[PDB]
Symmetry: D2
Amino acid sequence: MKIDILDKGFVELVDVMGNDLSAVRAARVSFDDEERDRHLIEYLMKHGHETPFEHIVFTFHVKAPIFVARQWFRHRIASYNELSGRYSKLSYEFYIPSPERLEGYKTTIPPERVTEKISEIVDKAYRTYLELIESGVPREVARIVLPLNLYTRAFATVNARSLMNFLNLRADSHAQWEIQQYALAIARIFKEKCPWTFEAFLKYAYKGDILKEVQV
Amino acid sequence: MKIDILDKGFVELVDVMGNDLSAVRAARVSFDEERDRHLIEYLMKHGHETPFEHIVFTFHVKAPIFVARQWFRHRIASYNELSGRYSKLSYEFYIPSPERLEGYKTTIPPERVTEKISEIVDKAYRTYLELIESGVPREVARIVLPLNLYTRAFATVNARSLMNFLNLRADSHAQWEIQQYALAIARIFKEKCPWTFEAFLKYAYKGDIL
Amino acid sequence: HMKIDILDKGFVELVDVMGNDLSAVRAARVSFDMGLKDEERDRHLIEYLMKHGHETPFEHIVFTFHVKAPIFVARQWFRHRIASYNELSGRYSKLSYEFYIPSPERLEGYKTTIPPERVTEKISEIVDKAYRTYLELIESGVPREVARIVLPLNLYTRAFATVNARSLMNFLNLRADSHAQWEIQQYALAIARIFKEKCPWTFEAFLKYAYKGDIL
Amino acid sequence: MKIDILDKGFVELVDVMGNDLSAVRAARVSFDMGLKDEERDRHLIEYLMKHGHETPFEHIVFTFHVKAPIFVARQWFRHRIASYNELSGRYSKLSYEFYIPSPERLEGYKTTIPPERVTEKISEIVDKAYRTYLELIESGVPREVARIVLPLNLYTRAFATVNARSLMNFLNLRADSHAQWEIQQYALAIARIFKEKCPWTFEAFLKYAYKGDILKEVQV
Ligand SMILES: Cc1cc2nc3c(=O)[nH]c(=O)nc-3n(C[C@H](O)[C@H](O)[C@H](O)COP(=O)(O)OP(=O)(O)OC[C@H]3O[C@@H](n4cnc5c(N)ncnc54)[C@H](O)[C@@H]3O)c2cc1C
Ligand SMILES: Cc1cc2nc3c(=O)[nH]c(=O)nc-3n(C[C@H](O)[C@H](O)[C@H](O)COP(=O)(O)OP(=O)(O)OC[C@H]3O[C@@H](n4cnc5c(N)ncnc54)[C@H](O)[C@@H]3O)c2cc1C
Ligand SMILES: Cc1cc2nc3c(=O)[nH]c(=O)nc-3n(C[C@H](O)[C@H](O)[C@H](O)COP(=O)(O)OP(=O)(O)OC[C@H]3O[C@@H](n4cnc5c(N)ncnc54)[C@H](O)[C@@H]3O)c2cc1C
Ligand SMILES: Cc1cc2nc3c(=O)[nH]c(=O)nc-3n(C[C@H](O)[C@H](O)[C@H](O)COP(=O)(O)OP(=O)(O)OC[C@H]3O[C@@H](n4cnc5c(N)ncnc54)[C@H](O)[C@@H]3O)c2cc1C
Ligand SMILES: O=c1ccn([C@H]2C[C@H](O)[C@@H](COP(=O)(O)O)O2)c(=O)[nH]1
Ligand SMILES: O=c1ccn([C@H]2C[C@H](O)[C@@H](COP(=O)(O)O)O2)c(=O)[nH]1
Ligand SMILES: O=c1ccn([C@H]2C[C@H](O)[C@@H](COP(=O)(O)O)O2)c(=O)[nH]1
Ligand SMILES: O=c1ccn([C@H]2C[C@H](O)[C@@H](COP(=O)(O)O)O2)c(=O)[nH]1
């Protein structure tokens, strides 16, 4: 299960422990009834009893630009392992906005030129980086010229409670657009694996705007 | 997978996400046994603990309250416990064996200590029942139940925090009763993540009993 | 320096505090590249943050409390994980003869076949018998960690609790509420009152825009 | 106290709650005791640190104001047991401020072009990137997009509230040769303020608990 985001990004589901019933079992404290189980999901969610959802956990492999990643990693109730720029020589991959991204703003140049200007500095910066590498500058110093739209990759392990908080904050029109796109992809996977929690979430607890407008 | 502890306790495995290779993927960030075990042993000797956060367990635990109060002090974890405010509580209490007092020289036989603990349990629970029956709400009436009352909780914990738990509780400074629970967590941990557990013991484990 | 007595023998005492309402104003304003301004503008900002659920800034206000409470209240309380605790150890201390004996008024609303005073009395009896067994086992050489297991949940414990304002507001949402047990609500009202004294602007805003409970 | 780091960075102490005795006090509640004596209390600290009792140190808390290159901020903010508020490039027009390494930053590395050329080549892309950034803003491009061309050595600012235990974990990990040299420098300043505010805790830490290398060789 892998969803493309932006121009070269993606959200990929690596693993999952549990399903809707894991939250139910934890709430009841019972190891071993659709309508009743689902009623309980709804009740916990409606009255703010969120601890049982911590028993559902996801691992994602995410590929995203550093400026998105830095917003993402502010979410502390989660586990992250990221590609190190200190030790790995970095790939020529950068997020270059679509002209589509600026259509809607009154600019004094065509958005094609915005794109071309962004692409131009990315190219010079990267070339400078490679010159420094070849000349023997250690990577951890050479990379500091790389712009914030460099794509990085991370594994993120997070429980459903923390994922829902993530959704309230990032699946929302006040969040930067680029991260909204990643949150839609998190939402899709979450919906597929925990359909009851997800619907109860949207109905009772979700505080954002986009997921009630935009299917899955 | 279920391991009985003390007189009426247990630890069972409810679910697990991942295995030794979940740490290996994370540390490499992508997606040969001897290379991969070597990476596990390398992370462990150098204190690179974050990759082990991606293996997660859920256990179902039956434990007396005084053990559970020490256990729940481990904050990097998720718990749901049965509510005494709402469940009529079950005539289940930890009564030590006589062997629990080995090494101690006591005024009365260990067998009389045992008997005295169970007398109190009996009189406490009966007072509790007296109060329920007379219309005292449960949340009030159970305040007289002793600290050896058995409780049950689900516990979800990643392998890093599980290793910290074992460092502190699978050790002879912990109270013996919680050591016994820690031994069981260790045994389940070993079954599910052998390379990680083996490297843990050899390189990072700080306790003595394991 | 603040001390509030709760129940028959408990208390909540403020030991120390870091920061004040302006500590959250300061933390927030760094976002816009700004700092402190005037009384009207900073007040308005604190209200703004609370309405919109920008809670991170309030993490920069921290309290240390010294609390005396029955073990059944302390157990509920220590479930709040985003905090730091150090408690009295039944493994190493000779425990004192102090137990919460509910007053007869605690039973108001409930028709009991035993009058209230006699309930109070039965609770005293059972507690006294437990403590005497406890003492007798200690005196006879039973290790303290073992002898204490006969002591009832209404035994008083003591603890230091360090908690930031954000996590404190979360504690107030859950415990300063009529769905919480009467005994912990009384502790929550003490906590709220100290919070009020020390962070009047944050507290007023919390109450108006974010507080989810009923009793405050 | 404000300590300058790198060419333009700093660590400044905004606030502190508690001191060494805050930990002695929290620790003494286990044994039904309070504060006992101004040399028994120093021994209690050493003792706690010697046997791995870390929780008492949670009751000392610091708030720091830090200015640091993004690449450093990103490493720092990986410490989850802490509270952070950072200057936002979504909502602010960022200032012309970048970490340009000194020529001495490349001591002990054989290079092919001299260290002043390296230093120059970094400035060049920084000046090109900032101009572009300003051109994009001038043209009506929103800040949250324009800033994506700015390099990792752009300076940012944050508040960090952190307890002494977490701060001691930070020091284990960042006041250490394995950590990137730039964040080492930040960890030294943090060490310095911690020592000035909590000398007993700090000395006990270096002696019994600290796992890094640098703070045993580098004074303060
Ligand atoms: C033999 C022994 C006797 C003890 N006696 C006492 C006693 O007298 N009094 C008492 O109160 N408790 C005592 N305990 C409890 C002990 O101090 C801890 O509460 C418990 O072991 C949890 O440890 P922890 O904080 O490492 O685990 P967790 O709470 O699970 O946290 C795990 C890790 O995360 C980090 N962490 C999490 N939260 C914070 C935070 N807020 N600040 C900084 N770092 C954080 C730490 O690095 C920690 O190692 C005792 C434990 C044992 C084994
Ligand atoms: C009226 C009521 C009845 C209840 N009955 C039960 C019961 O029957 N059984 C039972 O076990 N408990 C019950 N509780 C306890 C309850 O489940 C919580 O433990 C308690 O309210 C602590 O809340 P918290 O987790 O939000 O606070 P903390 O644990 O401090 O967490 C604060 C916030 O941090 C976040 N957080 C912290 N850690 C994690 C994590 N690991 N994953 C995701 N998010 C995290 C959450 O956003 C949370 O709101 C009851 C509580 C109340 C108020
Ligand atoms: C020299 C070195 C090189 C590194 N290179 C890499 C790299 O290649 N890739 C990469 O992604 N990062 C790397 N880092 C970052 C590292 O993986 C950690 O995220 C960071 O150092 C914070 O460490 P911490 O988890 O101890 O701190 P915090 O996240 O503040 O946690 C502090 C303590 O709390 C406990 N704790 C907190 N949260 C959890 C949790 N969710 N589960 C279990 N225990 C918890 C632990 O006991 C820990 O000791 C590097 C760090 C250094 C120092
Ligand atoms: C539109 C928007 C703009 C923002 N702009 C800014 C900016 O200008 N500057 C900036 O620095 N950041 C900003 N952020 C980041 C934001 O401040 C949070 O750090 C981020 O949203 C993560 O939120 P969280 O703390 O709820 O998540 P997590 O850190 O995963 O915490 C999850 C839950 O745990 C609890 N919790 C966890 N740790 C603690 C703790 N140490 N103390 C108390 N409670 C805790 C809380 O209940 C919280 O809901 C922005 C976020 C968004 C969505
Ligand atoms: O929408 C936002 C705005 C800010 N931040 C956090 C991430 C960084 O730590 C810091 C600056 O983010 P930018 O404004 O530079 O994206 O605040 C977010 O997480 N989300
Ligand atoms: O010494 C290091 C190396 C990496 N990281 C973390 C920070 C980022 O989230 C990610 C990659 O950092 P760089 O290696 O790119 O600096 O891992 C550190 O915290 N410290
Ligand atoms: O109102 C409640 C009920 C339960 N619990 C938690 C605390 C204990 O860890 C466990 C059992 O609480 P009692 O219902 O037994 O009080 O569930 C609470 O925090 N509050
Ligand atoms: O070995 C211990 C001793 C104490 N505590 C914590 C749990 C309680 O919150 C408090 C007192 O526990 P007892 O000493 O009463 O078991 O300190 C532990 O976690 N482990």
